[PDB]
Amino acid sequence: SKAELAAMSEAEFRALLQGKKETLKNIIKELDEKIKELLEEHPDLSLEEKLAELLRFFVEVFSKNFSPEAAVTFYQNFYELLRTYAAVLHGEEAVPPPLVMTPELAAEIIALFQAATESEEGLEAFIAFVLGDPALQKLIDMLGKDKVVILSLFAIAFIKTAVDSALEEADKLGAAALELAEENRGTAEGERHLQFYAATQGLKAWLKELEITETTKIFDDLIEERPELAAELEAVRDRVMGALLDEVLAEVDATVAAVLARLRALAEALDPKVRLTSVAVEVAWTEDGLLTVTVDVRTESGPLGATPEEIAEAQWAISRLLATAAAELSALERVLETLLKHVAEADKARVEAALARVETTRAGLIDIFREAAAAQAAGSPRTLAEIAAARLAALLAALAG
Q: Which of 41, 206, 290, 307 allows an S-S link to 286, with CB 3.0 to 4.6 Å?
């Protein structure tokens, strides 16, 4: 709950984030053992029976750890992976088109999944619905029902859906942390919750990186196990790794947009009598991947004409903008540094471009306040809104090239 976060100690919060990571690692370990066991110890079983066992495992894991909406996500992710491979084999025109999830299909899938968490009969109904689904059966047919390939594709969809569910829970934890920081604004409780939000960004970065490295591993094992397919497989991976890159780059573009919109709104809300003496932002990553962001915003003293309340309001708003933006952009930079080692050679320049877009945005946003403080400290009559607007124009020109 939000209240549980508001009472939470730093050590409890630290263990919560680490326990999320341990839970995911252990699921991935169980999944891989299960898939190896089905491929090896159970050679007498058909593809649909193997997939039935793995769907049982899916219901188990996700009912215990996540929410029933994940069933919808899994159906999507599995479909797209099958369709991606079919597209490599047969051409985009002969394969079905990208999935258009209807509200009715999603509600049916969720209802069936719920009933599967309640009784063995419900579980058979869910499995029969997934394995009888006409669209998936078509994609599977197009893949010749290859057990090693389809089960490896199921493992990627399973891992991908688990990260998606963890990303949503981390998003709810962060949004709740920001609500609590805002209700505790201007106090060290508020700064504690801002730091909580930054930690959740460290976690989101860890989670995308997990999806990236596990996807790569599953493909390397496929190629090892099916070397006659090394061509097709390497093409399929490049499309899967390509889609993951696009999601990250789309997120980079949206986060830059959101941060700069947050800057423009902050500049318009500022009382123009408020001035700065200094601004410092420190971003720290542990060797393990924990994220800390420390922001020190100092305002000018004296008979300027600004109420202590307008000052505190300004200094909290600026501190919140720097802490959230630096956390978000640093987390994206970490995900991109990992992506650079995994994309096709042709996409490496794009990832470096995206790195440079994130770096330039982070430094730029920080430098807007640093250079304003230094200007006002030196004696400039200019307001913080005016300096921010001018530097924002310059930063947007630099981002555009």
A: 290
Given a contact cutoff of 8 angstroms between Cβ atoms, the answer to whether 339 and 244 are in contact is: yes
Using CA atoms, how far apart are residues 5 and 10, in angstroms rounded to an integer? 10
Q: What would the two tokens of residue 192 be? A: 């504690």
Residue whose C-alpha is closest to residue 323's, from 288, 357, 358, 366: 366
Nearest one of 307, 227, 221, 225 to 270, comparing CA atoms: 307
Cα angle vertex 25, ends 180, 330, to 5°?
50
Q: Indicate the burial class of 131 (C-beta count within 10 angstroms; 0-12, 13-18, 19 or more).
A: middle
From the CB of residue 382, how many other CB atoms can be counted at a distance below 10 Å? 13
Contact (CB, 8 A) for 230 and 210: no
- Token pair 């891989």 is found at 32
Which position has the token pair 């889609």?
243
CB neighbours of residue 25 within 10 Å: 12
39 burial type by CB count under 10 A (0-12 exposed, 13-18 middle, 19+ buried): middle
CB-neighbour burial class of residue 59 (10 A; exposed 0-12, middle 13-18, buried 19+): buried
Could you tell me the resolution of this structure in angstroms? 2.1
Task: In whole angstroms, give the CA distance from residue 143 to residue 82.
Answer: 8
Q: Is 91 helix (H, G, I), strand (E, B) or coil?
A: coil
CA distances from 219 to 119, 146, 294 (A): 35, 15, 39
Technique employed here was: X-ray
CA distance 128 to 326: 47
Q: At what angle do helices 188-225 and 308-340 cross, to 10 degrees?
A: 10
Tokens 């307008």, located at residue:
310
